[PDB]
């Protein structure tokens, strides 16, 4: 198929993320290649290389078509594509489970693979719910979170999504009613933790778990908070016998300046979700990890087993490429690499503070955010970043990036400058 | 890692489908290779070749390591592993969307890609809910199904699974309260459809949709029903304005002797789910298709969009291999092939009707079932099937098979023979 034919089939037959059929404001751009930090896209009918400032929705940490990850995939392909995980095990699942157990915060000893972040969240909740049924406390079934969060699109995951971010108004009467604390602030305020605890305390007899994105809230608005809030949640959850779940689907694998964002605070959740960057952007795969205590309680309970099992659980191809992606990350000085990226993002985005439409500029590891005072019009900003050789996708009032780790100082410069310019055109 | 090392790691760190940690009665077998219809498994230190009678949980329709599917994957690997589907489109997605629209029941014109069956089911339910919100009937929010069904493990998916099979209590005050018709009989009885209509009639104003597995109920108990009920379901849904959803995640791509099980009845659902065999069992991928009318109403609704967007939506690698998998199926005389497999399963399984422990023997397309009078002990069944060079995995009281389509007559006969012998051992 040609790019013109792709557009036509696409417009008649393809849904896209949170999109329409036949009523699309803009119109998707055809991608034809991706290599390293660059995509090849079709503009005015011509191929152009542009920087993947978004890491293809936070996935491409090592860049596209990284030779070590292509080979990991090809090697596995020639030997064993997939076998069912029911009754069978295999080397890629074992290898990856060992890495994950070793590199995640202390005490996360068991791994349940699934096919996506949303599913890993539902698995996490199911772990929490079965845990308490195992302990003889079935009333502990509600979830608690703070506002501003995002956890995925499946119905249970939607229930702990920010009520505005996740559009709860469209869903009156259909979602579980969960317990929401106020928005977690940027700077550390012990009074917020105290208020969080008081709210939790009166619900504890009915809460299975607190579920949060640690340090960085992504799709709910790219807000950062002081790691010390996570230390306080760990302490609150411990004292009131409520499980603590960290969703590190966006934050995991170095993105925020630490291996896992949990690490900034030096704290272990009881249950953890990872995804997005796990396969270095090659294939869909996710994992939920839980402590030995959670694992044994579930296993010694009435049901005798965790009641879940995706068809493609522990797929050998995804697992093989993830092992390579993780080892590649661990085999380099990733901490310096992120520090440099962060400096690059700070330096390049500094001039945007002055802009008339800009309310905030903030950076956390390989994450750079320009917050505006109004919705960023994509029909303006998209062609504007393409013109400068950058793939950028603003969302709501934010002009932001999660650049691949392999980006050079010159590439970051190029990214930040495109971002600064999108912010300027918003003010005019 | 060695086989022994894998077991050691697996027993300590890996969850399996519907399994425990530390309380596993049987212990998983190590798989080291898969080619065509054969797995290489490690039995007592030694490698053996066994027929994949289960098709790796109903996925490997073309066998493993098929050269056309291998190629399609490596070809796409060197070009473009993945890009975000937000704002972008690509050839693998448009080719596959085009195919899916062309070969599925008529009127199914739009395609939403996602990573797994359970997710595609939650997407289907979301389309139904938003459709009726588009029409000003937000009261239409419940789902109706008949008993014995299975739809996945995520929380909405769970709510329409059989209330005994899915252990709905266990899940007391957590699942949405859905409407359940009695188990659909094998043989056609018009009294059943009349009772279904009468039950639907009294919930019509609160029903978004009817959701069923057409013709074959999979994980709920390998039950077959007369395609004519689907015709009745279509008629009832039309007259009462309740959307019809077919979960074809197990049944699709020729498995029941028709391309899609809906074809046995000539019926078009409003919304359809596929997965499992979609990629020929290489990678995880599912799809939810809906009619133009459904797409336009959601798009014209208050929301202006379908509020869903998985990270790895429409992953190029996964789509490219699906394209090649669908093309490979459509390019051969698949109907004759499936008729041949069915005839071979029928002939090979006949002798089991006489066995003292067998209550039924049924076949439908490339699905063969020995229904036993007691639950089947895997600790006896699994080694027995291995001894005969077959990978069989019984479920509850079923010794069943869904072999790859590339299985020769002799391989089918080896499969059925191992099934008979397992059924014989159950009777003692
Ligand atoms: O043995 C399995 C049983 C189930 C299952 C259990 C209870 C209810 C429904 C199910 F599909 N689900 C399964 C799902 C699997 C699998 C095995 C199983 O390997 C590939 O993915
Ligand atoms: O643009 C996207 C927006 C959302 C989204 C929308 C509303 C609320 C939360 C979200 F993550 N989710 C998305 C998920 C995507 C994606 C794009 C988007 O490309 C690959 O996966
Ligand atoms: C993206 C995301 C999810 C959902 O991931 P999918 O693979 O899109 O289902 C869940 N949690 C967090 C924090 C995320 O950023
Ligand atoms: C296997 C199956 C599902 C769920 O598939 P996953 O990929 O395991 O989420 C849903 N519906 C039916 C009918 C199935 O057979």
Curated annotation (Swiss-Prot), chains A, B:
Residue numbers binding substrate: 276
Cell location: Cytoplasm
BP terms from Gene Ontology: biotin biosynthetic process
A GO term, aspect molecular function: adenosylmethionine-8-amino-7-oxononanoate transaminase activity
E.C. numbers: 2.6.1.62
InterPro entries to which the protein is assigned, alphabetical: Aminotrans_3 (IPR005814), Aminotrans_3_PPA_site (IPR049704), BioA (IPR005815), PyrdxlP-dep_Trfase (IPR015424), PyrdxlP-dep_Trfase_major (IPR015421), PyrdxlP-dep_Trfase_small (IPR015422)
Primary role: Catalyzes the reversible transfer of the alpha-amino group from S-adenosyl-L-methionine (SAM) to 7-keto-8-aminopelargonic acid (KAPA) to form 7,8-diaminopelargonic acid (DAPA). It is the only aminotransferase known to utilize SAM as an amino donor. Can also use sinefungin but not S-adenosylhomocysteine as substrate.
General remark: Catalysis proceeds by a classical ping-pong bi-bi reaction mechanism.
Subunit structure: Homotetramer. Homodimer.
HAMAP family (UniProt xref): BioA
Protein's name in the database: Adenosylmethionine-8-amino-7-oxononanoate aminotransferase
